[PDB]
């Protein structure tokens, strides 16, 4: 009698994000990836083709009208054009379809990085500072101790220390084999893929049995998180993002009064610009420092998109005010829940000054 019974929330895998955004065309071409940081054309005021407001990805700007103007009127329902490949349908779909952005390098979801419980840190059993340094390209991590004697698994290496290790490994007399180091969110993804949850659970349970005090409490928290992951059948490396979803364009409207634009457009443009620059740098074999700085920039841009000002500096706008990111929409007294779901402005309502009507009855009111 009711359409849905329960609401379930889980950790999003990249496959799910792609499914949310990837839709196929009759021609066989698949669409749903935002590749250009372009919103609209300045002269025609018409959305670009592979941008944040594309009609081939999100839907036609005008209902039952094609982008190029080949098809118009309702008569053409479900007819994807051929010149531009836009689906002639209702424009309402522009507020339901998402599309996605594929990242040149993986980034870390700031929610699982910078939280009161740091789930990445708890799972990796590492202090939050070390995880942040690895993520933001301030230290290396020993993904594999290999054959070295003074190197331990998951050990932070400074730049000088890594240079010394490089000198050791490139010595003609070195028996050192199989040492691996990593920096960035890719290293975190490798560490998260290394975790075998069943064995970690068994080891933690055995250690908890022979433990007490704060050590027991910390191992209890680790076991709780690990058991949650075991039950949910979700891989922990999904906390490191390879693709990100794009919100439908009607939820970040770019209306004309001048053009008034949502802050999501600017944040998404930063993400796309940095991702494209990173891809170019990886295509021309740029110096390693430049590529690493671009990866750090991409991580920061995605961070500002997910929650502006949680980790680093706050991205201000044209005026010195914080940009409203995705997290700022669903929280606070001005957030979605408290401003639009638990309380709404309603129709069939009026408001006026009240005077005393002494001849009215208790069940009556005087309405102008």
Partner 1 sequence: HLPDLVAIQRNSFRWFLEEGLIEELESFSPITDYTGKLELHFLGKQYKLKRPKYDVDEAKRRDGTYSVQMYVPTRLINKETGEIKEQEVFIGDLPLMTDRGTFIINGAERVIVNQIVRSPGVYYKSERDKNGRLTHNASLIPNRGAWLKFETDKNGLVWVRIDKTRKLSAQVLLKALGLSDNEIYDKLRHPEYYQKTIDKEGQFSEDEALMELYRKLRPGEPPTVSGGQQLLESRFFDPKRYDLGRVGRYKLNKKLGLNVADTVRTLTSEDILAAIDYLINLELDLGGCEVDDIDHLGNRRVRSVGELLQNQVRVGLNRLERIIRERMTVSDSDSLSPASLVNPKPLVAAIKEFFGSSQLSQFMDQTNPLAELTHKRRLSALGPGGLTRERAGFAVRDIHPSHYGRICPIETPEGPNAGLIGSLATHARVNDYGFIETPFWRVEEGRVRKDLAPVYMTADQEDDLRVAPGDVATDDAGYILGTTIPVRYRQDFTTTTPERVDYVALSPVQIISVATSLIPFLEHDDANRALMGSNMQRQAVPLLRPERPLVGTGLEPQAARDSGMVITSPVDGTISYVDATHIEVTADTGEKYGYALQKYQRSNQDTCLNQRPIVFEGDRVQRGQVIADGSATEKGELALGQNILVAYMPWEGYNYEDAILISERLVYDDVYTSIHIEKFEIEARQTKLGPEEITREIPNVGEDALRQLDENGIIRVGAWVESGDILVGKVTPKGEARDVRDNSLRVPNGEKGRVVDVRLFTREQGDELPPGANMVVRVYVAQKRKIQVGDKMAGRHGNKGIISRILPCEDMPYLPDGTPLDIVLNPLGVPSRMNVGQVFECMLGWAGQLLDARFKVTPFDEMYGAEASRLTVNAKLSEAREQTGQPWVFSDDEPGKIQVYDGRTGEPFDRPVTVGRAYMLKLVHDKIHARSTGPYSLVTQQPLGGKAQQGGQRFGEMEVWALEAYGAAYILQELLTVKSDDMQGRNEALNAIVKGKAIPRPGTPESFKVLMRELQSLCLDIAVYKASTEDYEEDKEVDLMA
Partner 2 sequence: YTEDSIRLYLQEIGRIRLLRADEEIELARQIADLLALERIRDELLEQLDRLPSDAEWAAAVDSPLDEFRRRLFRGRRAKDKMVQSNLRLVVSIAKKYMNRGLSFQDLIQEGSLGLIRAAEKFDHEKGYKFSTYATWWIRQAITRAIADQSRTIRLPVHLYETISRIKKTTKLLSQEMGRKPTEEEIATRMEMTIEKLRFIAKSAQLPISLETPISRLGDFIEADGETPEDEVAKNLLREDLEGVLSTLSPRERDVLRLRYGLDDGRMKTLEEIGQLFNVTRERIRQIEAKALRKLRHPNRNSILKEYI
**Binding site feature residues for Zn(2+):** 66, 68, 81, 84
**What is the smallest separation between the CB atom of 97 and partner 1, expressed in angstroms?**
9
Is there binding between residue 84 and Zn ion (CB under 5 A)? Answer: yes
Nearest of 299, 258, 259, 257 to residue 278 by alpha carbon: 299
Q: Which helix (H) or strand (E) holds 299?
A: helix 288-306
- Of 49-57, 69-77, 211-219, 312-320, which part binds Zn ion (CB under 5 A)? 69-77
Helices 288-306 + 263-283 axis angle, to 10: 160
**What is the smallest separation between the CB atom of 30 and partner 1, expressed in angstroms?**
20
Range 274-333, binding partner 2 (CB under 8 A):
274, 277, 280-281, 284-290, 293-294, 296-297, 300, 312-313, 317-319, 321, 324
Nearest of 234, 244, 149, 160 to residue 195 by alpha carbon: 234
Range 111-140, binding partner 1 (CB under 8 A):
111
# binding residues, Zn ion (CB under 5 A): 6
Assigned token pair, 330: 């669903």
**What is the smallest separation between the CB atom of 15 and partner 1, expressed in angstroms?**
10
**Block residue for tokens 């991702």:** 275
Binding partner at 245 among partner 1, Zn ion, partner 2, none, C-beta below 5 to 8 Å by kind: partner 1
Is there binding between residue 346 and partner 2 (CB under 8 A)? Answer: no
Strand partners, 87: 80
Interface mask toward partner 2 for 134-163; x: CB under 8 A: --x-x--------------------x----
Residue 331, helix vs strand vs coil: coil
Question: What would the DSSP string read from start to end of 109-121?
Answer: -HHHHSSSS-HHH
* Overall residue count recorded for the chain in this entry: 368
Whole-number Å distance between alpha carbons of 174 and 194: 27
Binding partner at 324 among Zn ion, partner 2, partner 1, none, C-beta below 5 to 8 Å by kind: partner 2
Is there binding between residue 351 and partner 1 (CB under 8 A)? Answer: yes
- Please, which residue, 20 or 162, has the CB nearer to partner 1? 20
Contact criterion met (CB below 8 Å) for 103 and 242: yes
Strand partners, 241: 107
The pair phi, psi for residue 349, each rounded to 5°, is -140, 150
Binding partner at 70 among Zn ion, partner 2, partner 1, none, C-beta below 5 to 8 Å by kind: Zn ion
Assigned token pair, 151: 């190197």
C-beta atoms surrounding 175 within 10 Å: 6
Contact criterion met (CB below 8 Å) for 40 and 48: yes
- Please, which residue, 201 or 261, has the CB nearer to partner 1? 261
Question: What would the DSSP string read from start to end of 255-291?
Answer: EE--EEE-HHHHHHHHHHHHHHHHHHHHHTT--HHHH
Is there binding between residue 121 and partner 2 (CB under 8 A)? Answer: no
Residue 239, helix vs strand vs coil: helix
- Please, which residue, 16 or 216, has the CB nearer to partner 1? 16
Is there binding between residue 83 and Zn ion (CB under 5 A)? Answer: yes
Range 239-278, binding partner 1 (CB under 8 A):
241, 244-248, 250-251, 253, 255
Q: Tell me which residues touch partner 2 (CB under 8 A).
A: 37-43, 73-75, 129, 133, 136, 138, 159, 253-255, 257-263, 265-266, 269, 273-274, 277, 280-281, 284-290, 293-294, 296-297, 300, 312-313, 317-319, 321, 324
Residues that bind partner 1 (CB under 8 A): 3-13, 16-17, 20, 44-45, 95-96, 98, 109, 111, 241, 244-248, 250-251, 253, 255, 306, 326-327, 329-330, 336-338, 340-359, 368
């Amino acid at each position: 009698e009711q359409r849905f019974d329960y609401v379930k929330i889980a950790l999003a895998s990249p496959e799910r994000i792609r499914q949310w955004g990837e839709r196929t065309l009759p021609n066989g071409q698949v669409v749903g990836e935002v590749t250009k940081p372009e919103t609209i054309n300045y002269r025609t005021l018409k959305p670009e083709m592979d941008g944040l407001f594309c009609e081939k990805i999100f839907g036609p700007a005008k209902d039952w009208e094609c982008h190029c103007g080949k098809y118009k009127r309702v008569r053409h329902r479900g007819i994807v054009c051929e010149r531009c490949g836009v689906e002639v349908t209702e424009s309402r779909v522009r507020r339901h379809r998402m599309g996605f952005i594929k990242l040149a390098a993986p980034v870390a979801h700031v929610w699982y990085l910078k939280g009161i419980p740091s789930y990445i840190a708890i799972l990796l059993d590492m202090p939050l500072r070390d995880v942040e340094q690895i993520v933001y390209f301030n230290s290396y991590v020993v993904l594999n101790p290999g054959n070295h004697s003074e190197l331990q698994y998951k050990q932070l290496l400074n730049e000088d220390q890594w240079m010394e290790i490089e000198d050791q490994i490139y010595a003609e007399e070195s028996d050192l084999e199989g040492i691996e180091v990593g920096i960035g969110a890719e290293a975190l993804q490798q560490l998260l893929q290394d975790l075998n949850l069943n064995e970690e659970s068994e080891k933690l349970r055995q250690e908890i049995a022979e433990s007490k005090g704060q050590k027991r409490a910390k191992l209890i928290k680790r076991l709780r998180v690990i058991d949650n992951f075991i039950g949910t059948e979700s891989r922990p490396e999904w906390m490191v993002l390879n693709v990100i979803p794009v919100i439908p364009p009607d939820l970040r409207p770019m209306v004309q009064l001048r053009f008034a634009t949502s802050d999501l457009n600017d944040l998404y443009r930063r993400v796309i610009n940095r991702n494209n620059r990173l891809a170019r740098l990886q295509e021309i074999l740029a110096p390693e420092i430049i590529v690493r700085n671009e990866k750090r920039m991409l991580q920061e841009a995605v961070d500002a998109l997910i929650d502006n000002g949680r980790r680093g500096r706050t991205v201000v706008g044209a005026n010195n005010r914080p940009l409203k990111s995705l997290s700022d929409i669903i929280e606070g007294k001005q957030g979605r829940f408290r401003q639009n779901l638990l309380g709404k402005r309603v129709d069939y309502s009026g408001r006026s000054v009240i005077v005393v009507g002494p001849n009215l009855k208790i069940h009556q009111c005087g309405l102008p």
